[PDB]
Every structure is written in structure tokens, then in C-alpha cells.
Design a protein around this ligand. Sequence first.
Ligand SMILES: CCCCCCCCCCCCCCCCCC(=O)OC[C@H](COP(=O)([O-])OCC(O)COP(=O)([O-])OC[C@@H](COC(=O)CCCCCCCCCCCCCCCCC)OC(=O)CCCCCCCCCCCCCCCCC)OC(=O)CCCCCCCCCCCCCCCCC
Ligand SMILES: CCCCCCCCCCCCCCCCC[C@@H](O)O[C@H](CO[C@H](O)CCCCCCCCCCCCCCC)COP(=O)(O)OCC[N+](C)(C)C
Ligand SMILES: CCCCCCCCCCCCCCCCC[C@@H](O)O[C@H](CO[C@H](O)CCCCCCCCCCCCCCC)COP(=O)(O)OCC[N+](C)(C)C
Ligand SMILES: CCCCCCCC/C=C\CCCCCCCC(=O)O[C@H](COC(=O)CCCCCCC/C=C/CCCCCCCC)COP(=O)(O)OCCN
Lengths: 175, 52, 56, 178, 459, 606
Amino acid sequence: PDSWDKDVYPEPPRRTPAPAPQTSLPNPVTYLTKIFDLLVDRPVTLAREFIEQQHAKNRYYYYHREFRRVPDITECEEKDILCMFEAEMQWRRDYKVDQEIVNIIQERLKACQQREGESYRQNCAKELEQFTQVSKAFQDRYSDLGAHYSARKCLAKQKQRMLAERKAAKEAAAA
Amino acid sequence: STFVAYLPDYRMQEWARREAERLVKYREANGLPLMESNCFDPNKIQLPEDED
Amino acid sequence: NVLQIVRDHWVHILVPVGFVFGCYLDRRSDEKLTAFRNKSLLFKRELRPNEEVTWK
Amino acid sequence: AFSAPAAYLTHQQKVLRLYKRALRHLESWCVHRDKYRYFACLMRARFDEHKNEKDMVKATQLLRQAEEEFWYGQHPQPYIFPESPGGTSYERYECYKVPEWCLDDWHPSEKAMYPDYFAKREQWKRLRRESWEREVKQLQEETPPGGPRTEALPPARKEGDLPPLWWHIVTRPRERPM
Amino acid sequence: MLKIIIPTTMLLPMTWMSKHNMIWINATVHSLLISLISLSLLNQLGENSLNFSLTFFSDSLSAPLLVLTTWLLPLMLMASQSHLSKETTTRKKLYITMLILLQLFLIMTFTATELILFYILFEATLVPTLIIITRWGNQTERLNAGLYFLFYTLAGSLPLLVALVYIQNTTGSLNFLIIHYWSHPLSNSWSNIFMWLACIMAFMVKMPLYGLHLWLPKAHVEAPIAGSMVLAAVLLKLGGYGMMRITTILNPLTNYMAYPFLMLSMWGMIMTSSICLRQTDLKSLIAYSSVSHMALVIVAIMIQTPWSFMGATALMIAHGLTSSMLFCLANTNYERVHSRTMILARGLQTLLPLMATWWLVASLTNLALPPSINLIGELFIITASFSWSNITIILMGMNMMITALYSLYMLITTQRGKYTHHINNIKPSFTRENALMALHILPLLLLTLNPKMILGPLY
Amino acid sequence: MNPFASLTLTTLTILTIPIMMSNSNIYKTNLYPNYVKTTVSYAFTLSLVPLLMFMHTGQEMIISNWHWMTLQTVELSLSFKMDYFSVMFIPVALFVTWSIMEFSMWYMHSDPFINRFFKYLLLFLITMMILVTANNLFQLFIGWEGVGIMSFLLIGWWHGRTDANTAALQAILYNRIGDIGFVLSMAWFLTHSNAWDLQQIFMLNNECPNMPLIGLLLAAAGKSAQFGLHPWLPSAMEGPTPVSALLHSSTMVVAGVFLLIRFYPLMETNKLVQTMTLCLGAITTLFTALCAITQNDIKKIVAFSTSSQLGLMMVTIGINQPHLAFLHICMHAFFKAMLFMCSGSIIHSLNDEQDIRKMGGLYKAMPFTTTALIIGSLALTGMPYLTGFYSKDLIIEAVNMSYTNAWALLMTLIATSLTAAYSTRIIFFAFLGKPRFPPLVLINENNPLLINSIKRLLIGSIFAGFIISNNIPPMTVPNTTMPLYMKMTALIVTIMGFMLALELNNTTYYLKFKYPSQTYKFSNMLGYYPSIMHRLPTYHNLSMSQKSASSLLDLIWLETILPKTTSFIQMKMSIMVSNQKGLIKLYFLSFLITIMISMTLFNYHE
Ligand SMILES: CCCCCCCCCCCCCCCCCC(=O)OC[C@H](COP(=O)([O-])OCC(O)COP(=O)([O-])OC[C@@H](COC(=O)CCCCCCCCCCCCCCCCC)OC(=O)CCCCCCCCCCCCCCCCC)OC(=O)CCCCCCCCCCCCCCCCC
Ligand SMILES: CCCCCCCCCCCCCCCCC[C@@H](O)O[C@H](CO[C@H](O)CCCCCCCCCCCCCCC)COP(=O)(O)OCC[N+](C)(C)C
Ligand SMILES: CCCCCCCCCCCCCCCCC[C@@H](O)O[C@H](CO[C@H](O)CCCCCCCCCCCCCCC)COP(=O)(O)OCC[N+](C)(C)C
Ligand SMILES: CCCCCCCC/C=C\CCCCCCCC(=O)O[C@H](COC(=O)CCCCCCC/C=C/CCCCCCCC)COP(=O)(O)OCCN
């Protein structure tokens, strides 16, 4: 279905084998599937086509909301409440977006494990790799803010991590 | 209960899904890591002078 | 004969009248916080040709 | 369960209780019928071996040794009748037993069903009402002034009298109320 | 927010200007209508709260509490109109006035924007409950219960007033939004330790914290049915709401100042669940259940994690509903046998089958049967505590075992076995009591379909 | 779409229709049990088709059809796993439930609340399907708790009986003990793996640590009644015979084994947990089999047989053979449910008598019951070519051909012998000899419901092993090369069990009496485990709950410290202040003292 972007949710080309019967007995699942196709699938298809005909007579659209990019917490003065409010709201929206990205990657990982079958450990190394890097980034972003989190606390965490990295490079270059 | 069930999505969950889809598509197309461990770019962070 | 009903039904409307009055008071209270209407950096916008305010 | 107990058990009652209990446990050990007959005849011989001693001290010591014998040799899983206090169907039907006074709380539509039964119940209630004071008077007459000494109750001595405190004994629900 | 406050205030002239045989009908109908109106507050945003004005606001934590508070008054009116039949018209109207004042104070408490107005209403809620307990209580111990309930709260919360006034002097404001945006850490000083203590104990007393709960088994048992319902369902949640609000100022002092309270609560849940195993009084057992359940909310608030906050909100809502239902169920039997002993009236499933079904459902909900919202809250808090420290799982699992043990003990003792032979005045269940049970239990099951409405702002 | 998903969801959703109609005018009619039985039979017939599709192509799916809630990164959805285990176990459970319901239509005929009984049985079946088909840990927990609550409600069916309530509460306690470990596993898998779904858990755990697997083992031991938490299963025989046949015999008690089977990709990488599972299963299958050989209540004997089979299943899991354990579950269901139906038929025909000591010659009195129970015992004892031969003998062979704890191996072999030992006892004391029941003979097994319900699972217990074992794909490397004496170990030990038990039983006819030995008393009293663990810990807990927690701490010292101390101090201070006799001569002197103190203390240093 075209209801979703197939590059965000990749899927292998779906190779399936040909039915090559080697016995002379009838296949029960074939007859059962024919009965299913002509008895339950066709009425459902008819009902869905009626529903689609009804929908075609009334077509309206809903639009995805787009937000401007406002200055973030680093460009706000210490006690400027309005810039602080806008930056905090933008940070909350970015946090939700990052959570949804992690959800997308997790969905890929789950789908991949089931789809591959018994060879999943070697079959989808890439999904595991993608999830490891995304999880590491999300952890380094939001790991230990706890409740009452804010853009200021994330900024302080980033500043502390940058100081640690700068010191590590300082004593790394001295060797 | 019917009113509560059909409340408009003001918590903005589908909006977050669509924004994340857009960003993942853009970052997968151009070889970006899909997330960086730095929320704010260091070009506008002013750390103290030196370590010591 | 509205006598033997209105004297019994006038208390039955005390609460809905209060709810309507509360809604009206909420709108009037909202009218006092229009300092940043169409002024936020996220929702700053050019007005439509016929409308006067983005929200009331 | 139907008899008012006494203050204590006599020697004969204790010996009979022990005899019945030992026979039951021996039957539990001896599953087959002919073997149980053999060992029950042996048990009867063992009890009759000392039935004629006139010394109460030695008889009581024999009873003590017999109780110790039984407690050492008892079956850990003796046979219990299904409806007995230890049986698998002891209190199975106690949730189906509804007291008779619940019928007074029925709706008039429910009593429209079963009219004859409720007429009989009404005359039963009239009979119960008409006899209470006579029962109380008989009870307060036939007891010693210093309170009753036994739980046993007297019967109806006159002709128009019903036995005192009869209503809840006569109107038991059932063993199988449903 | 005035669209809810003004009708609740108008409930009073309608009550006083009603005819003596129409007070209950009008009160119940208009309370239900106010609850329906308040249902509109569940439409919360994803980022910031609903700032109605400079005085009131609403967030995702206040809305479920407001809906529960508005929904509870009709149930209290339903449960109260049985034992108040012989009252005079003036006394009935005064009782309804006390209940309406309680609702108004709670509604204005859960939406107050500043901490001083919050404190004022949070303590204004004391006088109606105190009057109810000490005037319409049944036994002679209601006076002692009222004294305990009043003085524990006041002694715990006067230092909160002093601390709030000091905070406003040092910071310039006590508006919650300004405080949250202008948050700053506490230095590890003795003065900061005592300012932490003053800002915390006021809510620990009302949770109640283990060792500070002595007032609860008295107040919840001696109060009439409506008083007990409002005490268990809403008044215990004021401490949790206040703590989740006020820990914004407190960090990082909480990282080590919470050790005694965490130890007290995680051992007191075990102690209270064990106390519930040997209780000769049913109402006392239901009261101790509340302490046992609120210790977990104390833990969740104290460990300061989003999962713990969501679990705490869900558990507060679920506990309120379940405790109210259990208190109503116990009152139904008390109004029959006129005693609170548990082993007096037994085998009640044979006599009242639909009440037996209600008892079974309430007991299943109490012991957190999946997928109840009780389970959602408790499991979220358990996971948060496991992340805090893996050894917490021992206490959490033991508490889950003992909770089911005493819940099914209470069910079996009252509803199973053989009915007492001499209690021959057990009339069939009234339509009012069955409707009360249904209106208590249906929202619980319905909230399982949309649990995000009661998971708070961290969702 | 292909029919697999639709049929797999339909066979689960059509089991709930009679639950919805529980308030309509079919629930107040004598037609309701037939309606429920027909619904179950139709559900079995419908579920037979996805099994055929898997048998053809190995088609497997996961179905996440509803999204419940999203907590930050985690997503909780109504997801169903329709893999080999689910599509193979649903038809067997539906077949057994159909047979048990048809039996219940006859055995519960005089029950005033039969409709309620049928509703309850249906509810348990729905919860079991929820447990089995679950794809995430929360859904599987929902099923885990639903089956336990239905066990509680069905064990205490006769709620006027004190022992039924006691047994129900005992089962609840023993299952909460394992629920502790279940919650431990859930919490660990959520914090560490960040998901409750099976697909994610397997992917992120290639070398699983100890804690989650030990929690899973504890939960399985609680549910499957292993040696630590065993005694609740024999006590669960208080409920009606259909409840014991359906729940505590073939479907519920295998839930812990199923849980351990579902997590085999994580248990493959842990050896300590495998060793613990092996030892626990071995000790359980020894102890319950040893307890069964001296029991006189038939239901207790079959319950101990079920517990021994569960121990053998845990042994099979502990040697890294989970598919064999699932196969043994499927085979054991048939003949163990049939054994319970035969025992219930005997109980009904002898006027509620359950002791074998009052059962005599029924070989000719009840020919069909004897035939069915003989076939069930032969299947149970791993008689060659019976449905039990395709699972239990392969289990024994695998245990013989593995790097195994030697004590566990010996205990498993002794349990295999004791199985034949106890089976012989049921036949010897129930069907051979002279009658020992009361003279009023009410024996009658000429009811079509009983006959057909027993006959269906009779045909199953005869042919299901051959039908299934030759139709599932091979997921196991076989033991193709074996010494001849070890290939025939299980048969030899079963034959020795038969002969020794028969000799010791035939010894009972002799006219000789002797007092029991201490080994007999240990075996008959269940090793004194209920005589000690049901009295000491309960007494100590209930006495500390009142003496220490209630009286000493809550009512005495917590009262002493905060409120009573301040009350006493305020009373003393009030008395001290308030007793002045109103004489000016005293407080004017006090005024002078105050005036003097003020000048020096507060005046000479401003
Ligand atoms: C393939 C090559 C390898 C070959 C292997 C071997 C080949 C064959 C060897 C055969 C050896 C003999 C097999 C039969 C065994 C005995 C049969 C029997 O029942 O005799 C009755 C006789 C007395 O019975 P009674 O009290 O007169 O009965 C009263 C009425 O008759 C009551 O009548 P009732 O109507 O209640 O009926 C009673 C019922 C119940 O009978 C009983 O009361 C006794 C049941 C328990 C013994 C059953 C054997 C279980 C052994 C498990 C050992 C596990 C380790 C335990 C370690 C514990 C450490 C403390 O009778 C039965 O169940 C039938 C007998 C057992 C049937 C199964 C026998 C075959 C399976 C075992 C042999 C397996 C052969 C193949 C093996 C393949 C792999 C190697 O007791 C015994 O002879 C057995 C005693 C052996 C165990 C003693 C353990 C020591 C106890 C005290 C130790 C010191 C403690 C100091 C204090 C410490 C405190 C810390
Ligand atoms: C007596 C006999 C019993 C058995 C017979 C029963 C007959 C069958 C009926 C059982 C139905 C099965 C339930 C299965 C769910 C179907 C309905 C479901 O889809 O709706 C839910 C919705 O339910 C509501 O969300 C629950 C409402 C919450 C409670 C309302 C409050 C009522 C006021 C009570 C006051 C209590 C205050 C306590 C604090 C709040 C799911 O929400 P959602 O997945 O999104 O819907 C997707 C589509 N939308 C978004 C466009 C709507
Ligand atoms: C019945 C239950 C009701 C509820 C009870 C609630 C309990 C409230 C207690 C809260 C605990 C924190 C209070 C004080 C904080 C730490 C206490 C002390 O042990 O810490 C050490 C302090 O060392 C010494 O112990 C000093 C404290 C000695 C005086 C306190 C004695 C209290 C004992 C009994 C308390 C009873 C509480 C209940 C009153 C009724 C740490 O050493 P140090 O790192 O150097 O100092 C850190 C503090 N700085 C940063 C400000 C410098
Ligand atoms: C039902 C029982 C409940 C009783 C609770 C009572 C204890 C409440 C906790 C302490 C209450 C008093 C704290 C003071 C209120 C806050 C004031 C504040 O935060 O400012 C501090 C003030 O700090 C103090 O003055 C502390 C005074 C403490 C004296 C009274 C001690 C009372 C007993 C303490 C322990 C009680 C707490 C736990 C008890 C639990 C109940 C047993 C900073 O002082 P600065 O003027 O700024 O100087 C620093 C810069 N130059």
C-alpha cells in the first residue's frame, strides 16, 4: 500500500517459491483457499468497494502542521521569560520527534526479526547496527534528566559532556 | 465516553510521527546518522577559557 | 397555569445559567491577555484581508 | 449431632469408641473384605480377652496402652465417608441451603407463583405464632431455679402443646435443597 | 475554568431553595451534569498546560483528578441518602452544603496557579470534612478521629506555609510556571535541608507516610460513608499532587534526602499489608489498604523518574475509585447488620448474589488484576524502582503477594462459608446500591481502553 | 489477504460470542451448555485450517492489529504470535475442551448453576488462548493472571465448603510467589532491552544474563507446580472433576512449561539456568511420583501423575530440547484428560466415592471405562506406538545421550519406573478383584455424552502421536546411533515397575498384618511438606502481623511517640500554668523577679 513511505519502512523483494506438487493426492489447503476466496473475500471486497464509492462522493483534506524554527535556549538571556518559553516548547517538540524516530527504528528491528526467520542473527545486522547508534544518540541526549526535565538541564548535560571531551582530548594530545 | 474517545489529537502524536518520518527519510537519503548526540550545535556554546 | 411549576422549576435552571455566566466570564477573562496576539515568533502571521484578529 | 452431650464419657463409652475407631482403621489397612473379617475377629478376641476384669485401675491402664497402640498403628489416610467431617463431599451443599425466612422478602409477583405453598406457609406461621408463650412457660417451669444443667430439652407433655424450641429444628432446609 | 466553578457554587442556592422531597434529585442531577461538563478538561496539549487565566490553569495531571472529584459527589449523594432519611430538612441541606463546599474547594485547589492559593484551599478542605466526621459520625470515637485528622495535617503543613513565604521572599514569586522556568538548585546546606523538610512533610502527612498514618484508620472508620469516600478517593491524592508539583524547587537535595522516606514507605507497605491480614474490622482493613497502596505512590514520587510519575498518577486514580467502591460495599453490609465486625455476617453470596459479584470485581481490582489501571500504575512504579535499585523487586513482589492474600481473605470471609443463622433481616439489594456499585466500577474498566488520559504530563 | 491471519483471529474471537450472550435469553435456558459446546467444536474445526497451512508451508505470522499506548520510546500493541507453538496448541486445547464440556453436560447435570459453570470454563479457555497466542510480555501476563483467577474461581466452586476456599487461596498464594519472578523478568526486559515484545528481546539478547531467566524459571515453577511450589496442584482437586480434567491436568499446568519454551532462544545461551531447570524438574518428577504410589484418592494419584509429567517436561527443557517438551505437552494432554474423565465416571457411578479402597470389580461392570483407562495408562507409561511413545521415550533417549547431571538422570529413570508403579495401583485397586462399594448398585455408563466424549480422546490417545510426529517438520537432530541396552532403557524400567508394583499389590491378599514403616509414612504424608510449610511459616507470619505490626508498633509505640507524648506534655504544662491560687502575694513577687531580671539581662547590654 502507498499509505506509507517505503523508504522509511524498507522491505525485501519478497521471493516466494512456485507450487510444484509431486504427489497425486489433492491439496486440501488449495480447496480451502478457493472456498475462502469465493466465500468471504469476495463479499468483503464488494462491501469495501461500496464504502469507497461512498467516500469518493465526499473528499476533504486535513493538513500536517508545519512549525517555524524559533531561537533555542542558548540564544536566550538568563531571565528572558518569553524566549525561554518558546525555546522550551521547541525543545519539547524536538524531544517528541526524537522519540518517534527511535520508535521507527525499533519497528524495523521487530519486523526484521520475524521476517527473516531462523537466520535472523546474521540476516539483519544492519537493523541492530541502526538501533545501536540511534539508542546511543538518544541516551546521550536524554538519559538522566529525570522528571521535571527542561531544555536548560539538557544544555547543562551537553556542556558537561563537552567539558569532559575537551579534557580527554587535552590529555590525549599531551602523550 | 464517546466524547472522550473522539477527542482531537491535541497531544500531537501523528504530527510527531510525520515529522520523524520526514527527518528519517531526509537523513537516510543523504548518509546522515539519523541522530547526533549533541542537541545544540557547539558553534553557539561558550565554554570557559580552558580546562585549567 | 405557570404558578405551580415556575415556583418549582426556577431552581432547576440555576445551574445552567451559572454555566453560561461562567463561559461568558471565561471569555471576558481571556480578553485581557491579548498582549501577544499574533506576535509570537512561532505563530506570527500576516492577517487575512477580511479578518481583524487571529483569535478572540 | 442430635443428642445433648453429657458432662463426661464413662469407661464403657471410651472403650466402645476405641473399639469402633480401631475397627475402622483396621478396615482401612485391610482393604479386602475376607482379610478384614479375619483381622476384625482377631480384634474382637483381643477386646474380649479383658472384658470381665473387676479392677478399674488395671482396666484404665489397659485402655491407656490400647490408645497408645492405636495412635502408633493408626492409618495416616483412614477411610472417611464422603459426607463426613473429613470427607470429599462434607460441606458441598451448604451454599444451596437457604433459610426459610428469605421467602418473606419475595416480591408479590414471585408469590403469585406458588399460591398453595404460600398458603400452607402462612398457616405454618400462624401455628408457630400460636404456640410460643406455652413453650416459654413450659421451659421456665421444668427447669431448676439455678439454671439448666444439661442441653437436653423436654417434650410436649399436654395435648395442645408442641415441643419447646422446635421451629428451627423442624424447618431445616434439607441435605439436598437443590 | 469558571464554567465549572460557577455551577458548583450555584449548587448551593438550588439546594437551599429546593423542596424537602426534591433535594437529593436536584443535587444528583446537577452534580452529574457538572461532571459531564468537567469531562471536557481531558483535552490536554502535548507541551504546555491550559493557562485559563492568571489565577487558574490545567495540566495533564490536574485533569484526571478534577474529573474524579466532580464524578465523586453524585456517588456520595447516592450513598448518603439512605442513613440520612430520618434527618430534618435543614440538617440534610447542611450536609449537602458541606459536600458541595468540599467539591468547590477541591476543584479550586487542583487548578490553583500559585502555591499560596493552593495552600489556602488545600487547608480550607479541612473544615467541611472535620464537620462531617464530628457531626454525622456514628460512634463516640469520631471526636478523637477529628482531632487526630485536624492536628496531624496542621502540624505537618504550618512549616510548609513558612517555607512558601520564605521562598517567595527569596525568589520574588510563587507562580508555578515562573518557578518551573526559573528553577535553580539547592546547595547542600543545613538550611536547605530544613527547607526541603518543610516543603515535604505537609504532603507526607496526608499521603500518609508510614508512621504518620495513625490518623487515617480513625478518620476513615469513624466518618460517615460520604466522608470516608471523599477521604479515601480525593483527599489522599492532594499530598501526591502537591509533591509532584513542589519537587521542582527541591532538586538536587532529593537525591539523598529521600532515603529515610523511601525506606519508611517500602517497609510500611509490607507492615500495613501484614496488618490487613489480621483485622477484625472490615472498614479498618479497607483503610489500611489505602496506606499500603499510597506508600507506592510515595516511592514513585521520591525516585523522580517519568515512568514513576506516570505510574503514580494512574495508581492514584485507580486507588481512589477502588477504595470508594470498597467503602460503599462495606457500608451496604453495615446498614444491614449495624456492626463492623467481619465475621458477624458471613456467607452473603447465598443471600445477595449481585453484591457478591460486585465484591468479587472490587477485590479483583484491588489486587491489581491485569489489565486494570491499578496494574498499570503499580507495574510502572515497580519498573521504575527496579531501575532505581534491583533489590526493590523483593519488597514489591512480597507486597503484591500479601495484597492478593488479604483481598481474597476479605472476599472469602464475608461472602463465603455458611450464612449466620440468626441474622434474619437481610433484605434484598436495593436498586440504589447496585447502581452505586455499577457507577463505581464501569469507569475503572472503561479507563483501560484509554489509559493515556490518566498517565499525567510525562506521557 | 491470505486466510491464515483471518482464521487465526476468528478462532479466538468466536470463543467470546457465548460470553456476550451471557445476559441474553439463552443464559436462562437449559440450552446454554449445548450452545457453548457447539461453539467450542466449531472453533476447533475452524482452527484446524491454519494448522494445515503450517503443515504445508510452515507459514507463520505476527499480528499487531491494535495500538494501545505509547510510553516515550516503547510501543505497547495488541500483538498475536501465530507461530508453530500457537497454531499447534490451539486445536489440541480446543479438542480437549470440547470433550470436557461434553463430559460436563453429563457430570454436572444436577448442578443448579451449570450455565455459570459453562461460562466459567469458557472464560478459562479464552484466557488460555490469550496466554498462548501472546506476542508481548504484557499480553502474556494478562493471560497468566486470567488463568490463575479462573483457577481460583473454579477450585472454590462449592463456596460453602471450607476446604475448597482454602485450596483456592493456596493456589493463589503459590502462583503469586512465581508472579514475583514474572514481574522481575518484565522489569529487567524493559529497563535493559527497552521493549516487552518478543522480536526485540531476542534481537538485543545474544548472551542473556542470569536475572531474567531465573525470574522466568521461578514463574514457571510457580505455574507448573515444581518441587518448591508443588503442593497447590494436589489441593486443587477440591473442584469438580471437569475442572480438574481441563485446568489442572492438561492445559493450565503446562503454562510455565510453555513460558519457558517461548524463551528458548535466550535459554540456549545460559547454562546455569539450564542446570537449575534440569535439577528442579528431576527432583519434582521423583518426588511427586514417589508420593503418588501410596495415595488412595484417585484424583490425588492422577494429580501427582500430572505433576510428575510436568517435572519430566521441565527436565526436557533443561537439556536444550524445547520442541520435545512442546510435543510432550501436546501428547500428554489427550490421555491425561481422558484419565480424569474415566476417574470422574467412576466417581459418578459409585455415588461420589473417590477412594480406591472402596472400589472393587469394575472390569466387567464398566467395560468402556476400563478399556479407556487401560489405553490411557498404556499411553501414560510410554507403551510402544502409543501417543506417549512419540514424546516420552524420545525424552528419555535425549536425556541418556546428553552431557547431563547424573543424579538428574537417575531420578528421571526412577520416576519413569514409578509412573508404571502408580498406574498399576489404579488398575489393581480400581478394576480387579471383588466389589468393595455399598450394596445398592447404581453403576451405569450407558450415556451417549460420556461415551462419545471419552471415545474422541480415546481415538486421540491412540493415533495422535503417529499423526503429529510424522507431520511436523524436523527441528531436532536425532539420536541415530545408540547402544541396544540404552535404546530400551525406558521400556525395561517400565516393565520392572509393572512387575514390582504388581508383586507388592498381590502381597495385600495375604492374611498377614504389619504396622507401616517410616518410608511408607514419609511417602503417604507427601514428605510432611504440607504438614510443616502450611503450619510454621503461616503461623509465624500471622502472629508477627498482629503481635508486632498491629499491636506493638501501630497501636502502642507509634501512638506513644508522636500524639501521646505531645498530649501528655501539653497536659502537664497546662496544669503547671493553670494552678495558681489567685493570691497577689505570689505573682507580684514574680513581677518583681521579672523586673529585676529584665534590667540586668536585657538592659545592661542593648
Ligand atoms: C536396569 C538395571 C538397573 C536395575 C535397577 C534395580 C533393579 C530392581 C531393583 C528393585 C529394588 C526394590 C524395588 C522396590 C523398592 C521397595 C518396594 C516397597 O514398597 O517396599 C515396601 C517396604 C515397606 O513397606 P511397608 O511400610 O511395609 O508398607 C505398608 C503397606 O504395605 C502399604 O501398602 P500400600 O497399599 O500403601 O502400597 C505401598 C506402595 C508404596 O510402597 C512404599 O511404601 C515404599 C515406596 C518407596 C520406595 C519405592 C522406591 C523409590 C526409591 C527412590 C529413591 C530416591 C532417593 C531417595 C533418597 C532419600 C534420602 C533421605 O507400594 C508400591 O508403590 C509398589 C512398590 C514400589 C513400586 C515401584 C518399584 C520399582 C521402582 C524402583 C526400582 C526401579 C527399578 C528400575 C530402575 C532403573 C534405573 C536404575 O519399604 C521398602 O522396601 C522400600 C525402602 C527403600 C527406601 C528406604 C530409604 C531409607 C529410609 C530411611 C533412611 C535412613 C534415614 C535416617 C534419618 C535421616 C534423617 C535426615
Ligand atoms: C452484561 C454483559 C457483558 C458482556 C456483553 C458485552 C457486549 C459487547 C461490548 C464490549 C465491547 C468490547 C471492547 C472493545 C473496544 C471497542 C471500542 C474501542 O475501540 O474504543 C475505545 C475508546 O474508549 C474510550 O477511549 C474510553 C473512554 C474513557 C472513559 C470515559 C469517561 C466517562 C465518565 C466517568 C467518570 C469517572 C472519572 C474517573 C477519572 C477519569 C478505544 O479507543 P481508540 O483505540 O483510541 O479508538 C480508535 C478510533 N478513534 C480514536 C477514532 C476513537
Ligand atoms: C515516625 C516517622 C515520621 C517521619 C520521620 C521523617 C525522618 C526525617 C529525617 C530526615 C533525614 C535527613 C536529616 C539530616 C540530613 C543528614 C543526617 C546526618 O546523619 O547526616 C550526616 C551529618 O553528620 C552528623 O550526623 C550531623 C547530624 C547530627 C544531628 C542529627 C541527629 C538526629 C538523630 C535522630 C533524628 C530523629 C528524626 C525524627 C524527629 C522527631 C552527614 O554528614 P556530613 O556530610 O558531614 O553533613 C552533611 C550535611 N551538610 C551537607 C549540611 C554539611
Ligand atoms: C505530624 C508531625 C509533622 C511535624 C513536621 C515538623 C518538621 C517540619 C520540617 C522542619 C520545620 C521547620 C523548618 C523551617 C521552615 C523553612 C524555613 C527555611 O527554609 O529557611 C531556612 C531556615 O532554617 C531554619 O531556621 C531551621 C529551623 C529549625 C528549627 C525547628 C526544628 C524542628 C524539628 C526539626 C525536625 C522535624 C522534621 C521531621 C520530623 C518528622 C515528624 C517526627 C534558612 O534560614 P536562613 O534565614 O535563610 O539562613 C541562612 C542564610 N543566612
